[PDB]
A paper describes a structure:
In addition to collecting X-ray pump X-ray probe SFX data of haemoglobin microcrystals, we also collected diffraction data using a single pulse, in which case shockwave damage is necessarily precluded.
However, the microsecond spacing of MHz XFEL pulses raises new challenges, including possible sample damage induced by shock waves that are launched by preceding pulses in the sample-carrying jet. We explored this matter with an X-ray-pump/X-ray-probe experiment employing haemoglobin microcrystals transported via a liquid jet into the XFEL beam.
Residue numbers in the entry:
A (entry chain DDD), B (entry chain BBB): 2 to 146
C (entry chain AAA), D (entry chain CCC): 2 to 140
Amino acid sequence: HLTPEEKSAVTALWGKVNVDEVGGEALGRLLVVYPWTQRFFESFGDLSTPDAVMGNPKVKAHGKKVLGAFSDGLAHLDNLKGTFATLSELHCDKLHVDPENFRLLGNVLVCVLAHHFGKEFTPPVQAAYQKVVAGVANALAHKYH
Amino acid sequence: HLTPEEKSAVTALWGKVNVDEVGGEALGRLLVVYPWTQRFFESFGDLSTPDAVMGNPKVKAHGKKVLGAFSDGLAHLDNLKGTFATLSELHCDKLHVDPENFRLLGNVLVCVLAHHFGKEFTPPVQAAYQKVVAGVANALAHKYH
Amino acid sequence: LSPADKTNVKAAWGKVGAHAGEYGAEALERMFLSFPTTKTYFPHFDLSHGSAQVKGHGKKVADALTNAVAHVDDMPNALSALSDLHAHKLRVDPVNFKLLSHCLLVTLAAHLPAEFTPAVHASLDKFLASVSTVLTSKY
Amino acid sequence: LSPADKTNVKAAWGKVGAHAGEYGAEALERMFLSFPTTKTYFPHFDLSHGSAQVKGHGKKVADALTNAVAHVDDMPNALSALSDLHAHKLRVDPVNFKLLSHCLLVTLAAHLPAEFTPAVHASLDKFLASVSTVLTSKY
Ligand code: HEM
Ligand code: HEM
Ligand code: HEM
Ligand code: HEM
């Protein structure tokens, strides 16, 4: 549930998002800031230090696919429970990720948008994105309910 | 989401619940164990000590309404979003209660059932009741999502 | 913990006594059934009811909680090695310390009806939250 | 906090300096717009954009955080009075400290993009978590 002038500032800002870097940036910062999330990602190799994680080819690659799922959710903000049906099944039944972690990745993305977009990332823009990331987080957690 | 032997154990134990007292013992315990919750019940009067809360007659009276709402949930386990749509609006848009507190009242309800049934409140029975309370907390949180 | 909370914790835990190991086994069993995501941490255990291993691990959890009660004032140094195991080696998600604490409260409620007052309920939650704060302090 | 954590926080907050209060006010404003459940704690405030009351409170928060960094090693005795105010008198829900900590990070990132490395991000989060634990310690 976004207003017309929220949905237009959300979609405006996304078109300027370097889809290559931000995704790896968001996934790398989650693993360093909340180190328990590293146990879901053992096959990605060396996550021993902050430089090992950010410079890690599989993290940077996997980040493109995360940001790419975020891109598809904006397009269909009226049917997230649908868009994210397959990823809900993966994350909740196969992997067993605690839904608190969906919120933390949403919140680390917001910190990263603020890092790149600076003063263009205004408090009212942030309040519109905080609505998006919660909606994503609840869509992913639907297979637990 | 409840097996047939689950739903039958849930229903069988509920029928034996003192509807006059359990709802007040649960609401009273929320207010003593998690004191920030006392700021939403300012007008219920004296909540200054543990003994004031448990014997506060507005707390017992309102405790019966809360339990009534749960009985109504147990009767409609397949449509919880629809049964609690009005209560969700009250708690979410008017009262501004954080959804985490809904989980805390549900978990306090589970402690109180174990206090009263002792040995009968077996691990399998507890696990059927946890699904229910999680069901009810997610339904009350719907107007946020 | 306030002097009243220390007295309430010691009162309750005194009455648990020799059954602490049995109660810790019940808490672990209640957690695996209620929150089945917690099982991903014990892939090397038989988690069936009455499993020798769960009884064995029940006694280790209980002996640690009794230690914590006897050292309430210096918890950070009593449990520091357990803080290293659970954060550094095992990488346990902090949300999981709240699910085991709740399952302990449910176990004590079911066994000590007379002792489980509102006041004692509240002091035990504070104590289990204190124990969870130390065990997740390498984060 | 660890030796490396202390160094990253002091360095980052050193380069905030006079902007301390301006940054505090922006974090409160981001909080009030993103999480509207936090507005109920300030009924006696003009919460509209550019509000003089939010600017003055901004500086009070900032000055409390500057003292915390300057007393990093003795944090429960540098913030003792504010736990009383926040827990006992105002009954501030513990989730809300996590919401302010997150808006304080979105502000430091928008303004200091060169200093907001992933290692400094991790150090500030542990620091604001510690500050959050002390202010909720009367629960
Ligand atoms: C909040 C938004 C999140 C989104 C949008 C997201 C999205 C995705 C996507 C698109 C995949 C790839 C699926 C495929 O192509 O087969 C994936 C895989 C995965 N996700 Fe997430 N995810 C999120 C949160 C999380 C979190 C918080 C964790 C862990 C703490 C996590 C752990 C994983 C793991 C372990 C994989 C499998 C990687 C592999 O082994 O190939 N996800 N996620
Ligand atoms: C599963 C959890 C809960 C259920 C089933 C529940 C149910 C109810 C019901 C049936 C009412 C009465 C509605 C009416 O009379 O119009 C009510 C009112 C209320 N509830 Fe809840 N509630 C829950 C959780 C909470 C929590 C956690 C809080 C606060 C921390 C809260 C605060 C209130 C308040 C302030 C009222 C209005 C009281 C008044 O009449 O002055 N509720 N709730
Ligand atoms: C109050 C909370 C807890 C206490 C006091 C506690 C205590 C202990 C103790 C004493 C050990 C034995 C260490 C040794 O062998 O030297 C242990 C091991 C372990 N704990 Fe915990 N623990 C707690 C919570 C948790 C939680 C929440 C989880 C996961 C959900 C967990 C998972 C484990 C695992 C996987 C082991 C290692 C098992 C093995 O390899 O044999 N613990 N814990
Ligand atoms: C890092 C977190 C926080 C810090 C450092 C902090 C610091 C302070 C300080 C220094 C004061 C004024 C003390 C004085 O009068 O001298 C204050 C007042 C207050 N704080 Fe906080 N605070 C924090 C978080 C929060 C949060 C999350 C809330 C609510 C959502 C909150 C609500 C209030 C309220 C209502 C007042 C009193 C305003 C008035 O009536 O004048 N605080 N805080």
